[PDB]
Amino acid sequence: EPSPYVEFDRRQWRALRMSTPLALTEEELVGLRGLGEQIDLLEVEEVYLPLARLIHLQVAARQRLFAATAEFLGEPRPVPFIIGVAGSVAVGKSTTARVLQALLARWDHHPRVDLVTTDGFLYPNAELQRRNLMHRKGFPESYNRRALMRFVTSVKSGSDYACAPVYSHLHYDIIPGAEQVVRHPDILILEGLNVLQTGPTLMVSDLFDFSLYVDARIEDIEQWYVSRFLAMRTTAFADPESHFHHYAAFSDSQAVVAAREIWRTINRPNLVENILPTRPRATLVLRKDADHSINRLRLRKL
Amino acid sequence: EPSPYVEFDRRQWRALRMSTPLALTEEELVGLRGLGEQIDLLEVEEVYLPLARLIHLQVAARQRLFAATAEFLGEPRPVPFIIGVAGSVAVGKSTTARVLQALLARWDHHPRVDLVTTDGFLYPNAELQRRNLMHRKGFPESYNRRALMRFVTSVKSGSDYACAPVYSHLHYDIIPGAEQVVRHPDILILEGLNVLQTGPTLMVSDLFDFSLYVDARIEDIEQWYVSRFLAMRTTAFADPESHFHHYAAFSDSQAVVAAREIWRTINRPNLVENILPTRPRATLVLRKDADHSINRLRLRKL
Ligand SMILES: C[C@H](NC(=O)c1ccccc1C(F)(F)F)c1nnc(SCCOc2ccc(F)cc2)n1C
Ligand SMILES: C[C@H](NC(=O)c1ccccc1C(F)(F)F)c1nnc(SCCOc2ccc(F)cc2)n1C
Numbered sequence A, B: 001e002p003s004p005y006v007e008f009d010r011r012q013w014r015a016l017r018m019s020t021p022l023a024l025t026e027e028e029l030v031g032l033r034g035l036g037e038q039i040d041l042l043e044v045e046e047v048y049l050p051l052a053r054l055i056h057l058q059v060a061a062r063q064r065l066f067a068a069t070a071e072f073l074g075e076p077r078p079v080p081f082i083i084g085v086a087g088s089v090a091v092g093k094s095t096t097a098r099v100l101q102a103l104l105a106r107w108d109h110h111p112r113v114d115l116v117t118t119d120g121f122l123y124p125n126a127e128l129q130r131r132n133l134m135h136r137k138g139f140p141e142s143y144n145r146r147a148l149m150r151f152v153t154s155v156k157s158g159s160d161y162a163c164a165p166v167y168s169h170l171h172y173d174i175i176p177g178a179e180q181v182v183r184h185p186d187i188l189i190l191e192g193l194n195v196l197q198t199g200p201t202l203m204v205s206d207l208f209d210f211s212l213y214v215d216a217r218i219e220d221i222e223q224w225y226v227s228r229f230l231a232m233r234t235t236a237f238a239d240p241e242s243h244f245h246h247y248a249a250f251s252d253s254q255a256v257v258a259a260r261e262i263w264r265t266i267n268r269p270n271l272v273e274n275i276l277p278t279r280p281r282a283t284l285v286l287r288k289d290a291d292h293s294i295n296r297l298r299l300r301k302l
Helices: A010-015 A026-030 A041-072 A093-105 A125-131 A145-156 A218-232 A245-249 A252-281 B010-015 B026-030 B041-072 B093-105 B125-131 B145-156 B218-232 B245-249 B252-281
Strands: A005-009 A081-086 A113-117 A162-168 A173-182 A187-191 A210-215 A284-288 A294-300 B005-009 B081-086 B113-117 B162-168 B173-182 B187-191 B210-215 B284-288 B294-300
Touching: A005 A010, A010 A041, A010 A294, A026 A041, A041 A081, A041 A093, A041 A210, A041 A284, A041 A294, A041 B041, A081 A093, A081 A145, A093 A113, A093 A187, A093 A210, A113 A173, A145 A162, A145 A187, A210 A252, A218 A252, B005 B010, B010 B041, B010 B294, B026 B041, B041 B081, B041 B093, B041 B210, B041 B284, B041 B294, B081 B093, B081 B145, B093 B113, B093 B187, B093 B210, B113 B173, B145 B162, B145 B187, B210 B252, B218 B252
Parallel strands: A081 A187, A081 A210, A113 A187, A210 A284, B081 B187, B081 B210, B113 B187, B210 B284
Antiparallel strands: A005 A294, A162 A173, A284 A294, B005 B294, B162 B173, B284 B294
């Protein structure tokens, strides 16, 4: 029974590592780890290094394809390779993305590898209040998807620079005047929630040369979300300038109630209605277990 | 203002022809022309030959990409290149597809180029009657899209053969027992209506290495449809075995009434609600004028 997919387990996948150096020290790993994440050097080696090898093979071949079009066109720093990383809140895709960026940037030919999270493209709160969308922050309509598409297009067009706006998780809002400048990289990783989504018109997913989806049982992500929420009381919420400082004095059980409620009404439905439906398109799915461990992968060979 | 697209006119596009031989005689052209079509050798040269050049550049480069994945995978007749041709009924995509197939098969390296129309994947009439779908023949739900996806996947998987069922336009139904065998080509052109469409799960559009969309003003396609309908009275409908023989004795004005009605209730809405929304994804759009002439094109350079 023929398939566009190939399943692996860590045993099979780790084998595919070949002679790929490990250029990442333990000090550096944890400086990319997010609160709650269990990723160790043994996982970089056995999972992210094959992945990095795969990606670097394809970067070369993917550009030949743009060569062909430019040769047709009778034409005279290539077309940036674009990676998308998607997944639910709290699944740890943010970390994956940051790890991936460090692994790729340390290829001996030394490419420039920018990383942009989509949260800088959320509408500011006042704009969200206007549209009646606060209660749906993180859903697709709470993003300026036109702005976001222009940006990625602009970068891939080979343009000299592009700017993105900047979100502050501290203040739960877009930072006035702040901007992230992306000066023509070789690779761009774009990380967000529904970034793999498909539409009537053309969308960023269409621009992706490679894409990555970080998966887990829905019960387990709830678990990680709630724990991280509780942990955030002595972290992010502890700062008296946090938009969410009021949460710092919640007890374990109020905190679990609040966390569960946000999860039930905002984060779970977005996952189910929007994010999860996009899994089938992803070049690679990283499947995590309850203990955070990546033990199965699903690659698109077609 | 940067764009994924490049517009052309026939002047600009024809220039891109380079030294591409014309291996198609006028006898052979018209034997592919459909009732009403105005395509002449001057259009093959100035439009289909650039197109053929473009396609043959990309076939080479697109396979390097599957090489990269197989080299990663540590692996030991390549992965068939898959072209999709979409557009409304009566726009003449059927012809384009057949022309394209003849132009590609006569490349000096002599590749096998199969062509499959999607109509063989319509549900038989009795199955359509069951689902209450006769009045929506040609809409996406009147196709066995699972069967269709299995097929294209099977071919691209590199499998030795795949079978498709066969529709009879004469009898307005699927022919019992008939089958079209596709024995591992180098290129497969797949022609149909919503074939460029996108979904929750993975679909044929995802398997396309190249895609082609044949466009025209909606008023003009109505015009061509109605004329062809009238013309079909002394052609297809003239055969007393035609499911539609009753139409042969319609006068011009009854015939125009019938044709307009079918167009209003079945073919126009499908075009508007489903087909036309898919135009943005197509690698190349062929834009035809009221006189049938291809005078502008839109290529995806990203
Ligand atoms: C609906 C809202 N979503 C977001 O703020 C959001 C939107 C887009 C991208 C990322 C987030 C994020 F991660 F949660 F901050 C939200 N979801 N949880 C909260 S409470 C703030 C605590 O933030 C987190 C973030 C991540 C966790 F794993 C646990 C708690 N809020 C305000
Ligand atoms: C709704 C139905 N659609 C189809 O049969 C159909 C479905 C899928 C693919 C192609 C067709 C096709 F082209 F019209 F035969 C239909 N549309 N017009 C008719 S009348 C039969 C006359 O066929 C045509 C076909 C094409 C024309 F340009 C003009 C008349 N019928 C029965």
